[PDB]
Write an enzyme that holds these catalytic residues in place. Structure first.
Site, mmCIF file in Angstrom:
data_model
loop_
_atom_site.group_PDB
_atom_site.id
_atom_site.type_symbol
_atom_site.label_atom_id
_atom_site.label_comp_id
_atom_site.label_asym_id
_atom_site.label_seq_id
_atom_site.Cartn_x
_atom_site.Cartn_y
_atom_site.Cartn_z
ATOM 1 N N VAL A 42 0.824 -1.057 -0.197
ATOM 2 C CA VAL A 42 0.155 -0.237 -0.106
ATOM 3 C C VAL A 42 0.758 1.233 0.062
ATOM 4 O O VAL A 42 0.438 2.261 -0.798
ATOM 5 C CB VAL A 42 -1.046 -0.074 1.295
ATOM 6 N N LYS A 43 1.948 1.274 0.983
ATOM 7 C CA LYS A 43 2.741 2.560 0.842
ATOM 8 C C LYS A 43 4.023 1.791 1.411
ATOM 9 O O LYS A 43 4.352 1.254 2.262
ATOM 10 C CB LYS A 43 2.189 3.514 1.800
ATOM 11 N N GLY A 80 6.911 3.778 2.919
ATOM 12 C CA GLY A 80 7.124 4.974 3.696
ATOM 13 C C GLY A 80 8.780 4.938 4.032
ATOM 14 O O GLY A 80 9.555 4.013 3.525
ATOM 15 N N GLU A 83 10.210 5.019 7.005
ATOM 16 C CA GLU A 83 10.514 3.995 8.235
ATOM 17 C C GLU A 83 9.723 2.770 8.139
ATOM 18 O O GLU A 83 10.168 1.865 8.814
ATOM 19 C CB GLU A 83 10.411 4.717 9.660
ATOM 20 N N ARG A 104 6.870 0.005 5.948
ATOM 21 C CA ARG A 104 5.977 -0.412 4.690
ATOM 22 C C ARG A 104 4.822 -0.931 5.126
ATOM 23 O O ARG A 104 4.366 -1.455 6.230
ATOM 24 C CB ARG A 104 6.505 -1.760 3.873
ATOM 25 N N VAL A 105 3.451 -0.383 4.499
ATOM 26 C CA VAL A 105 1.947 -0.691 4.665
ATOM 27 C C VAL A 105 1.649 -1.587 3.832
ATOM 28 O O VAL A 105 1.754 -1.281 2.609
ATOM 29 C CB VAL A 105 1.347 0.551 5.160
ATOM 30 N N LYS A 111 1.593 -2.737 9.306
ATOM 31 C CA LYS A 111 2.693 -1.812 9.284
ATOM 32 C C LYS A 111 3.810 -2.563 9.399
ATOM 33 O O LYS A 111 4.123 -3.086 10.822
ATOM 34 C CB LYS A 111 2.394 -0.741 10.073
ATOM 35 N N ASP A 123 2.312 13.564 15.194
ATOM 36 C CA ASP A 123 2.538 13.723 13.954
ATOM 37 C C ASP A 123 1.178 14.223 13.157
ATOM 38 O O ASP A 123 0.931 13.645 11.935
ATOM 39 C CB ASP A 123 3.239 12.587 13.198
HETATM 40 N N1 LIG Z 1 -5.656 1.412 9.012
HETATM 41 C C1 LIG Z 1 -5.449 1.571 7.803
HETATM 42 N N2 LIG Z 1 -6.764 1.540 7.209
HETATM 43 C C2 LIG Z 1 -6.451 2.021 5.843
HETATM 44 N N3 LIG Z 1 -5.608 2.483 5.265
HETATM 45 C C3 LIG Z 1 -4.432 2.897 6.050
HETATM 46 C C4 LIG Z 1 -4.359 2.316 7.280
HETATM 47 N N4 LIG Z 1 -3.317 2.573 7.874
HETATM 48 C C5 LIG Z 1 -2.615 3.048 7.075
HETATM 49 N N5 LIG Z 1 -3.285 3.254 5.856
HETATM 50 C C6 LIG Z 1 -2.826 3.945 4.320
HETATM 51 O O1 LIG Z 1 -1.295 3.513 4.476
HETATM 52 C C7 LIG Z 1 -0.907 4.838 4.655
HETATM 53 C C8 LIG Z 1 0.187 4.533 5.793
HETATM 54 O O2 LIG Z 1 0.008 4.952 6.919
HETATM 55 P P1 LIG Z 1 0.581 5.503 8.277
HETATM 56 O O3 LIG Z 1 0.142 5.121 9.466
HETATM 57 O O4 LIG Z 1 0.967 7.011 8.030
HETATM 58 O O5 LIG Z 1 2.315 5.017 7.869
HETATM 59 P P2 LIG Z 1 3.715 5.735 7.670
HETATM 60 O O6 LIG Z 1 4.631 5.125 8.384
HETATM 61 O O7 LIG Z 1 3.328 7.232 8.079
HETATM 62 N N6 LIG Z 1 3.889 5.676 5.909
HETATM 63 P P3 LIG Z 1 4.196 7.439 5.726
HETATM 64 O O8 LIG Z 1 2.797 8.344 6.053
HETATM 65 O O9 LIG Z 1 4.436 7.346 3.930
HETATM 66 O O10 LIG Z 1 5.393 8.037 6.323
HETATM 67 C C9 LIG Z 1 -1.677 5.863 5.220
HETATM 68 O O11 LIG Z 1 -1.446 7.366 4.768
HETATM 69 C C10 LIG Z 1 -3.111 5.375 4.584
HETATM 70 O O12 LIG Z 1 -3.095 6.076 2.947
HETATM 71 MG MG LIG Z 2 2.174 9.042 8.137
HETATM 72 MG MG LIG Z 3 5.135 5.859 10.458
#
Ligand SMILES: Nc1ncnc2c1ncn2[C@@H]1O[C@H](COP(=O)(O)OP(=O)(O)NP(=O)(O)O)[C@@H](O)[C@H]1O
Ligand SMILES: [Mg+2]
Ligand SMILES: [Mg+2]
EC number: 3.6.-.-
Lengths: 175, 231
Positions: free
Chosen positions: B23-24, B26, B28, B30-31, B44, B146
């Protein structure tokens, strides 16, 4: 009849649920579980609100079993402990385990690979009627669930009871 | 923890994660998304980078994961809508949570609403609701750590403005009004350099925050302090 699910994170492990009503030999089964003569975990079916509950508990149990880092003595006791909202081992085996007067019992066991469990013999050991797991709603008592997990009005306002239950089970080891 | 056992858990967890829909990726973590015992899930993974002392590296992944797990529990108990925690694997630093199926981040809703409206005034109702959510969050003494528009989702049906907070790796507990204003200031900065010409909207959130939190007056005074000091 039975209910069986593969574990997603441990694909060679099956988790099997059996539900019984009108259980006469309650205290006997209890002592047979303390002894180690009956297979699986004997759980208080009246505070299980969904198989997902048992599966989250079984998943964390298998995870720490494989890591050699369980809190309780055995895989069977770990499954029951994970059901508890708190980390008090003895309160947890007492509350979520079966009482001498139980007329409903749930049996949960975990098979891995092809080593099977004698299901017929285990059903053979209970003086009660194995009902479909679909009857679990009839036996689950929402009042007792809300009491033993101590679920808020605030928690009910943003999700299910199952959801609050899972959230406490999944994070108690860090709280 | 037996080394062989631990390494097996790690390779088991990445085998599972591979194959999943990414999904992402990032900075730190991967999602991924998938199914966990029948439920729609997001996982995560705070992966080790190899670019540092693996002791420091594992400590960091662990602390983030523990911080998020603890906050997600505290949110649920306090009536603050965030994802339910299914399972936290501390051997690999993976958080298994309910996927907010069909969600849209608040950032994407903002950019898509300012390209068709050509005005931020259609966003005021969004602003008010976010004031309510962060209000209640701060009133139980939870600091997000954040607050950005990418760390808020909107749960379908999008137009009802059902907000779900996410990304709690840097969350913590504090009654300090300065900590709460810093939390808000991080959000204001986020707005500033993500959604240009949304200053009207941040003030709209601030007004509703002031109204729905009765511990707000010290928070907003400290936020003015933080704006001035810049920290
Ligand atoms: N529980 C969830 N349900 C649906 N989508 C989610 C969920 N958690 C995360 N996502 C999606 O995946 C992304 C990652 O979430 P996040 O908790 O911000 O991880 P992160 O470490 O911050 N990655 P990044 O925002 O790129 O630094 C979010 O911006 C959403 O688009
Ligand atoms: Mg984030
Ligand atoms: Mg994070």
């Amino acid at each position: 009849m039975q209910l069986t699910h593969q574990l997603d994170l441990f694909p060679e492990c099956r988790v099997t649920l059996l539900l019984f009503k009108d259980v006469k030999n309650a205290g006997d089964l209890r002592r047979k579980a303390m002894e180690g003569t009956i297979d699986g975990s004997l759980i208080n079916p009246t505070v299980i609100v969904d198989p997902f509950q048992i599966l989250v508990a079984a998943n964390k149990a298998v995870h720490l079993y494989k890591l050699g880092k369980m809190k309780t003595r055995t895989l069977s006791t770990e499954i029951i402990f994970n059901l508890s909202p708190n980390n008090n081992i003895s309160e947890a085996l007492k509350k979520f385990g079966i009482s001498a007067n139980d007329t409903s019992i749930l049996i949960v066991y975990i098979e891995e690979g092809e080593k099977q469990i004698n299901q017929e013999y285990l059903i053979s050991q209970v003086e009660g009627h194995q009902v479909s797991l679909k009857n679990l709603p009839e036996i689950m008592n929402i009042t007792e669930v809300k009491k033993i997990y101590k679920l808020s009005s605030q928690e009910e306002s943003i999700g299910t009871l199952l959801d609050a239950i899972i959230c406490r089970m999944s994070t108690k080891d860090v709280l | 923890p037996e080394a062989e056992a631990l390494a097996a858990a790690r390779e088991r967890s990445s085998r599972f994660l591979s194959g999943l829909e990414l999904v992402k990726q990032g900075a730190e973590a991967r999602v991924f998304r998938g199914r966990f015992q029948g439920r729609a899930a997001v996982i995560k993974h705070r992966f080790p980078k190899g670019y540092r002392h693996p002791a420091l590296e594992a400590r960091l992944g662990r602390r983030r994961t523990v911080q998020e797990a603890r906050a997600l529990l505290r949110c649920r108990r306090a009536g603050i809508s965030a994802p339910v925690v299914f399972f936290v694997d501390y051997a690999s630093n993976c958080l298994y949570m309910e996927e907010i199926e069909g969600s849209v981040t608040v950032r994407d809703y903002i950019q898509s609403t300012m390209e068709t409206e050509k005005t931020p005034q259609g966003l005021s109702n969004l602003a008010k609701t976010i004031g309510q959510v962060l209000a209640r969050m701060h009133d139980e003494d939870l600091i997000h750590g954040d607050l950005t528009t990418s760390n808020m989702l909107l749960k379908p049906p999008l137009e009802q403005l059902n907000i779900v907070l996410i990304d709690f790796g840097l969350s913590f507990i504090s009654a300090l009004p300065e900590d709460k204003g810093v939390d808000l200031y991080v959000l204001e900065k986020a707005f500033l350099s993500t959604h240009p010409n949304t200053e009207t909207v941040f003030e709209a959130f601030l007004k509703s925050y002031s109204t729905s939190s009765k511990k707000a007056r010290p928070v907003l005074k400290k936020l003015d302090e933080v704006r001035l000091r810049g920290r």
